[PDB]
Amino acid sequence: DTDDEVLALITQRRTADLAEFPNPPWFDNLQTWLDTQKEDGTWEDVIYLSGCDARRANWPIQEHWNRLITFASAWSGLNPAAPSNWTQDDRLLSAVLTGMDYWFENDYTESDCMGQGGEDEYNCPCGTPGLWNQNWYCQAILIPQLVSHTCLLVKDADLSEEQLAGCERIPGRAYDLRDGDYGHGGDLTGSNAVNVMLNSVSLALFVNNLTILEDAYTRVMTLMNFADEEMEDGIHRDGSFLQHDGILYNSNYGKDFLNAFIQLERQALDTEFEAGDTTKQAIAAQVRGNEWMTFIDEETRQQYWDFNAVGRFVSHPTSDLQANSDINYNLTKLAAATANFEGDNDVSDSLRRLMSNGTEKLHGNKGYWASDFMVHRQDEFVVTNKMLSTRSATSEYVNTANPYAYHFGQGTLFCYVLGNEYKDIMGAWDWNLVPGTTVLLNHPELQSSIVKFNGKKDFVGSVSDGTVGLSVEDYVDPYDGAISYRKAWFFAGDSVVVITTDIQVNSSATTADAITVLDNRASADGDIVVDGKTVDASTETSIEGHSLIYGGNGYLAYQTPFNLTLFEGNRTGNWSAISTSLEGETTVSIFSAYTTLPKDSFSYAFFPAADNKRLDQEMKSPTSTPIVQDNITAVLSSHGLGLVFWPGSEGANFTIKFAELGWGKTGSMTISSAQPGAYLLRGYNDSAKGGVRLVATLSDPTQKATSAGFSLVLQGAKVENPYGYNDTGIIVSNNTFNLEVPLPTGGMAGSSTSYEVFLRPS
Ligand SMILES: *[C@@H]1O[C@H](CO)[C@@H](O)[C@H](O)[C@H]1NC(C)=O
Ligand SMILES: *[C@@H]1O[C@H](CO)[C@@H](O)[C@H](O)[C@H]1NC(C)=O
Numbered sequence: 001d002t003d004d005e006v007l008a009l010i011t012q013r014r015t016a017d018l019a020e021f022p023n024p025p026w027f028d029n030l031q032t033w034l035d036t037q038k039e040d041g042t043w044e045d046v047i048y049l050s051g052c053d054a055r056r057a058n059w060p061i062q063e064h065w066n067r068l069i070t071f072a073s074a075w076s077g078l079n080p081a082a083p084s085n086w087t088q089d090d091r092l093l094s095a096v097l098t099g100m101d102y103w104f105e106n107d108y109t110e111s112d113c114m115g116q117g118g119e120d121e122y123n124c125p126c127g128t129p130g131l132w133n134q135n136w137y138c139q140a141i142l143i144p145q146l147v148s149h150t151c152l153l154v155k156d157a158d159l160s161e162e163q164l165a166g167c168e169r170i171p172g173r174a175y176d177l178r179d180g181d182y183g184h185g186g187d188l189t190g191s192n193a194v195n196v197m198l199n200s201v202s203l204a205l206f207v208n209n210l211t212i213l214e215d216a217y218t219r220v221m222t223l224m225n226f227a228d229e230e231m232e233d234g235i236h237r238d239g240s241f242l243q244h245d246g247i248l249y250n251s252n253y254g255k256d257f258l259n260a261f262i263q264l265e266r267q268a269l270d271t272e273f274e275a276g277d278t279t280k281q282a283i284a285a286q287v288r289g290n291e292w293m294t295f296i297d298e299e300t301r302q303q304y305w306d307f308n309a310v311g312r313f314v315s316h317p318t319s320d321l322q323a324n325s326d327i328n329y330n331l332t333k334l335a336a337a338t339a340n341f342e343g344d345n346d347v348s349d350s351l352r353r354l355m356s357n358g359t360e361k362l363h364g365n366k367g368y369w370a371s372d373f374m375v376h377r378q379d380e381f382v383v384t385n386k387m388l389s390t391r392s393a394t395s396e397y398v399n400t401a402n403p404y405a406y407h408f409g410q411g412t413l414f415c416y417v418l419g420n421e422y423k424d425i426m427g428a429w430d431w432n433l434v435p436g437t438t439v440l441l442n443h444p445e446l447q448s449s450i451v452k453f454n455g456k457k458d459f460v461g462s463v464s465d466g467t468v469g470l471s472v473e474d475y476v477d478p479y480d481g482a483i484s485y486r487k488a489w490f491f492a493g494d495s496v497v498v499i500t501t502d503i504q505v506n507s508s509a510t511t512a513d514a515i516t517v518l519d520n521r522a523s524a525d526g527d528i529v530v531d532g533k534t535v536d537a538s539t540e541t542s543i544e545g546h547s548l549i550y551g552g553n554g555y556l557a558y559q560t561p562f563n564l565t566l567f568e569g570n571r572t573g574n575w576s577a578i579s580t581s582l583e584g585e586t587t588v589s590i591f592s593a594y595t596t597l598p599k600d601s602f603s604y605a606f607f608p609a610a611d612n613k614r615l616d617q618e619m620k621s622p623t624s625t626p627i628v629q630d631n632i633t634a635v636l637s638s639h640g641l642g643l644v645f646w647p648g649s650e651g652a653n654f655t656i657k658f659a660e661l662g663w664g665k666t667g668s669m670t671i672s673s674a675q676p677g678a679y680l681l682r683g684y685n686d687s688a689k690g691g692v693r694l695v696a697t698l699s700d701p702t703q704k705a706t707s708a709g710f711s712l713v714l715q716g717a718k719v720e721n722p723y724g725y726n727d728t729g730i731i732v733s734n735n736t737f738n739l740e741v742p743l744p745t746g747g748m749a750g751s752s753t754s755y756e757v758f759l760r761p762s
């Protein structure tokens with residue numbers, strides 16, 4: 001056996017791995033499924049419709065292969081959940097062989113049944129004999145996958161020549177068409193190509209062909225490399241997985257990519273097929289990006305995906321076991337696949353925090369530039385925010401699922417303190433009140449035809465330094481332009497300052513009120529509190545106030561008070577009217593609050609996981625101060641200074657005294673930028689050197705500028721370079737510090753970069 005030892009090792013590993021396909025509950029029906037099998041291999045209670053009579057989606061004939069794979073898993077003795085007395089039992093082997101015979105004998109013969117099946121223009125019209133389906137997916141992926149599993153599980157049994165012919169024919173017909181046309185499928189890309197190559201890996205291990213294995217592994221590892229174009233589907237360098245033109249989708253498509261990588265990497269360890277360096281870098285990036293999208297159910301310890309990375313599955317309940325039901329990948333197998341990861345690729349800490357089941361939480365602030373996404377986490381809450389630019393989309397209406405998701409991705413603000421705030425409330429949900437979004441009330445009329453849209457502006461990004469974050473969104477309504485504004489979020493500590501400026505409402509199209517939705521969650525224990533007064537919102541009630549407290553979260557209004565519209569109680573919706581689900585109707589208790597906005601601008605602050613004492617201290621001593629001024633938005637807080645130069649602010653100035661920041665008793669600072677951009681200014685008081693250590697963070701939201709023009713003008717202070725390097729475009733004089741730096745390009749367009757200087761009170 002020359003060099004087939006690598007093939008045999010990979011075969012052993014994959015055969016032990018493919019034995020895990022059957023659900024552990026399926027092993028109970030071994031005796032029943034064996035006894036109720038007919039003499040021709042079929043079963044009575046299984047639907048064997050083929051051709052133009054079968055069900056296009058979820059072909060019921062696959063139950064046959066499910067039972068065959070269960071038999072084979074029990075027979076091989078590789079699945080630990082199977083009773084040991086069925087190991088090497090000839091009854092299961094004979095049953096599997098008879099089922100394989102039944103399927104192979106009724107295999108179709110016209111190649112046009114692969115994809116264009118049922119089309120009269122091609123050579124497989126309705127009535128052509130054979131086991132095929134009008135759905136191209138059945139002949140390309142599904143049936144080949146099941147066949148590959150069954151054949152690989154019984155590779156060592158004495159198989160007839162017809163059985164081997166079928167085991168090589170059924171997946172080979174799809175593998176031979178890899179660089180060709182699949183009829184309705186056309187060119188297979190991404191998930192379909194990965195599934196085809198995975199089934200081809202199974203086939204190559206069956207027929208003992210190393211060339212097919214080389215080709216399939218090369219193709220798969222190439223498909224999982226970095227995507228560096230705007231909206232380009234794939235793993236980006238920020239850690240986000242895009243699909244369907246900028247729709248964040250780390251929870252479904254990227255999930256399948258990561259599962260395929262886990263499988264292939266664990267199976268091909270220590271061979272000439274283990275992933276290279278580029279693939280491991282991309283996999284580490286995706287693993288880290290997934291961890292920041294994962295929150296915990298504090299009661300059940302089950303981990304989920306954030307509702308901004310789920311897309312159309314938000315309209316499905318968790319019982320349907322879709323992308324929104326779980327993370328849906330084995331953390332132990334992911335740890336085993338990424339053990340050999342070294343250097344900057346090491347993701348051992350991510351896996352440690354994931355498998356800890358909430359005992360180690362993720363602490364910091366992260367900003368995704370390629371998807372306009374930002375996450376702020378403590379050990380006490382998880383806050384997410386997706387924005388809408390020319391490089392992302394809202395949602396999508398696919399396969400009758402998700403028709404009222406127009407407002408998603410248009411400036412959402414989700415909060416996870418318990419882990420069940422938004423669990424399966426989408427049934428009775430009011431889809432016009434998406435938490436965080438600033439929309440016109442019940443505009444437009446939500447329906448299936450109005451769902452997916454791309455942003456119209458480019459100045460939508462985020463700046464962060466790992467601890468504090470500032471996201472910006474030059475927003476315009478994409479469906480009709482009935483509402484436009486500029487909104488920013490400042491993430492620092494347990495507080496989120498939200499400054500909505502430059503509110504525009506096209507009153508010719510509609511006259512609805514411009515509102516900002518604070519939250520739309522499930523009922524939590526406690527009472528609604530407005531200015532310290534309990535409010536009964538069993539019926540939809542309006543009220544004004546400066547503070548709102550419910551479910552452990554606080555909402556503080558600056559200057560102009562709120563104009564709230566509150567509701568708490570049962571709503572009713574139909575799961576089968578928003579998706580293909582069969583759950584029917586649902587009745588859940590929902591608390592929903594949204595304020596009516598003033599005409600020009602409105603600012604407020606959000607304090608998750610806070611109590612009355614924190615909010616009282618804050619209202620009596622605000623640690624933050626929103627500042628709106630001449631196309632510039634600024635946030636003065638104890639943790640630093642957020643600063644937004646919106647488009648049209650070339651040559652403006654923002655002047656702030658050192659005493660307002662807490663740096664020095666005297667002295668001011670005049671800030672000016674050459675081109676629009678987002679900036680962070682954090683100061684640290686140094687008593688030893690007698691001065692202030694300033695850290696300046698910057699980025700480009702448009703992802704189209706190559707250089708920056710940061711300029712500071714100090715009064716009563718002196719700038720001193722600590723490292724003494726002008727290598728970063730730093731111009732240090734007596735009292736002036738200009739920063740001309742090259743911005744990141746390619747896949748890093750829109751990422752942040754920080755620099756240091758030292759100030760001395762003159
Ligand atoms: C042997 O297999 C049969 C068939 O399902 C099962 O009823 C029986 O419990 C098994 N015995 C043991 C010891 O697992
Ligand atoms: C392996 O597959 C390739 C591609 O179909 C083929 O060219 C080659 O002859 C095969 N090798 C063997 C030993 O069957």
Ligand SMILES: *[C@@H]1O[C@H](CO)[C@@H](O)[C@H](O)[C@H]1NC(C)=O
Binds near residue numbers: 020329330331332
């Ligand atoms: C991973 O798979 C093993 C074996 O089937 C199982 O015991 C374990 O619970 C799985 N882990 C998760 C997180 O599902």
